[PDB]
Design a protein around this ligand. Sequence first.
Ligand SMILES: *[C@@H]1O[C@H](CO)[C@@H](O)[C@H](O)[C@H]1NC(C)=O
Ligand SMILES: *[C@@H]1O[C@H](CO)[C@@H](O)[C@H](O)[C@H]1NC(C)=O
Length: 208
Amino acid sequence: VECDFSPLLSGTPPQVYNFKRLVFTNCNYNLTKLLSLFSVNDFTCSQISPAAIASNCYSSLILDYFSYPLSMKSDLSVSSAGPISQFNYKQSFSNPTCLILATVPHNLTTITKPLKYSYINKCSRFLSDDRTEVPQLVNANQYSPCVSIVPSTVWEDGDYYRKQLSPLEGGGWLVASGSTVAMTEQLQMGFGITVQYGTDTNSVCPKL
Ligand SMILES: *[C@@H]1O[C@H](CO)[C@@H](O)[C@H](O)[C@H]1NC(C)=O
Ligand SMILES: *[C@@H]1O[C@H](CO)[C@@H](O)[C@H](O)[C@H]1NC(C)=O
């Protein structure tokens, strides 16, 4: 009857384009209890507040978490053309959402570091003319089209990934490039929260 955030605290977190997603229904949560394990560097919301998201009742609550460098903050903003919002991670524009940037302290030994930070810097599609390039932007609540060809961790910065599509998928080529950022002194993470408001189904409530 309590929301289990355990898989977030055990093992190596994934990369922004392989964000691990936890779904929560019919349970109770202590959100300030979870954030206290971390040094919270950034906390921004949309159509909700950081105070409201901790003290409200939802039909459902979605939690996305990945490894993400604090340096790359502006790339998460939909205002920017940054490769993260375009090709890696996008939260729903319809529902209330929250994005949290935090650092995992040395005490939290159960969370292990990746070798580095990885992200997709370009993901596009070449039309049959083989001259025109159509960017393949990531949709809300979905992974990127290029996740199938981009590895869990990019081996070297500037690596290219291509795939010849079948007429089923439309023909043409699928192109992706990878980029790396050097691992920080302390692992930095990104947490994306999405909540749904129902009518008679608001089962997810704060632990009191
Ligand atoms: C545990 O965290 C505290 C900060 O709350 C820190 O001062 C301490 O060094 C950590 N424990 C160890 C064994 O480093
Ligand atoms: C559980 O949530 C309450 C708010 O409802 C918070 O004040 C408290 O600190 C949380 N529990 C712990 C052990 O921190």
